Amino acid sequence: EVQLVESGGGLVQPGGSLRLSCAASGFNFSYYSIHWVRQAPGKGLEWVAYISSSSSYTSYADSVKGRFTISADTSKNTAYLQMNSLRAEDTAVYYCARGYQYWQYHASWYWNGGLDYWGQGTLVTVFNQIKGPSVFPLAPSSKGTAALGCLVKDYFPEPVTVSWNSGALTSGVHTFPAVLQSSGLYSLSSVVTVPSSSLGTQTYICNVNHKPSNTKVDKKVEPKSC
Amino acid sequence: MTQSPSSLSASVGDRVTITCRASVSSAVAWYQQKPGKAPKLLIYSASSLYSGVPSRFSGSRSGTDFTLTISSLQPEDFATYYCQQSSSSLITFGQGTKVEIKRTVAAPSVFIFPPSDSQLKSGTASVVCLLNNFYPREAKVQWKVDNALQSGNSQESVTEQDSKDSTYSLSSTLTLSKADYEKHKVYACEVTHQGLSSPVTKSFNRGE
């Protein structure tokens, strides 16, 4: 019945501010420690900070010392991460996690209790600009199986979503992880393989959503005329 | 700075041992994470099984090194594994190790896509080369423009292993100015892979 629930994640700009909550239930809050661990896209876990409210012990990773502040309201069974002086690379999923109250005192060559309970995470996106994508067709060739797709170029920040024919087509779709271009803008392609015979009949439309700029674009993908 | 995970390919039934990269430090705890899901504690204090964790998972302190062993890999065990220590008041997670499933060699199907006419109207041309449904992940892509070998003007992206067929797909995208695109005729990507006895090239001539 132990549960940890993160909230408060969203879009924020460098030099703006954001406060994350970790709501705990199912345990005596003052007997434990609350940790913040983040994960950037495609990357490993990074421990960020902890508080043992009751002892008011706190500690921070050098990558965030002097920038982030951890605190706790015992009467609310809640811990907080106050995020200041935000930078692009603070973009990540932020998890809160439970450890022992006196974990540092216990830490030794033979003992490490670890972080037992975890929330499911809250997303923090640092952006300087907002920019919706342009969508171009990846047109099928004249070749059993044909490949087509669409190119989703020049957006910021992440993420974008892509479906095909309003979601009716899912079989054989591959939507690639976005890459950051030299321009500082994201780009990705979504592709699908279908039957060669189906090209003359079946209409293929990619549906691209970009919530940060509040844009939806539907783009038909058909053979190029020669 | 955090890192991309290293990778280990293994079959169901295989025994695997992961060694944590050593750093004065505390005893290691080991965690497991699947994509888009919270990490889970597996092993604490170097060798104690976390409540509920299967007994095929074990930990050992080799002196100065710490290891996680999975005695016999099950399908649900393909995941990323992290080791975790503390030092003074700071906790450190090691680089992830992704355990990936082994499968028979599958050569990619290669497709080349020219830039759309609507793209050209905004001054840039993107040429896309798709490698679809291949194993293992190691592939080399080489772009040629009128027989000139390109370098530094392409970017690759690769999918995770497919849930159904355990393959990978990869895109390589070539970026040119409109002017540079219209200056040249033959656009080709050449793909090297374990499943191809020799490299496969896909070509188009601009405007056909």
Added chain:
Amino acid sequence: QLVESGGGLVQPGGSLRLSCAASGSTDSIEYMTWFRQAPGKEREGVAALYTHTGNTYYADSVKGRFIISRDKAKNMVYLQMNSLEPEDTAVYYCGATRKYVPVRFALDQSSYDYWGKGTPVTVSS
């Protein structure tokens, strides 16, 4: 104030003796008790001693393997742990209460007021 010591790594079948040193007078204490807390599990009562009587109470899982005792002169409570098993791996805590507690609430976390920071115990081959 309570301070535990004597924690360490043991093989299955090993023995340890934990110590709990009290500061100040312990005359008004009703129960001195050893608790343990493993990851992902509630802090559970292991052994309790009723100070006026010397009567001891034990969790089912530790009966006959663990013994709680006191030396009033040294102002100390001990837990002798013989035949240690992997399931005994935990942080062990000393607790006390000067408030009355009914005989069968003797092994409950919240039924106690003061604690030490705990001494970790790992049992492993």
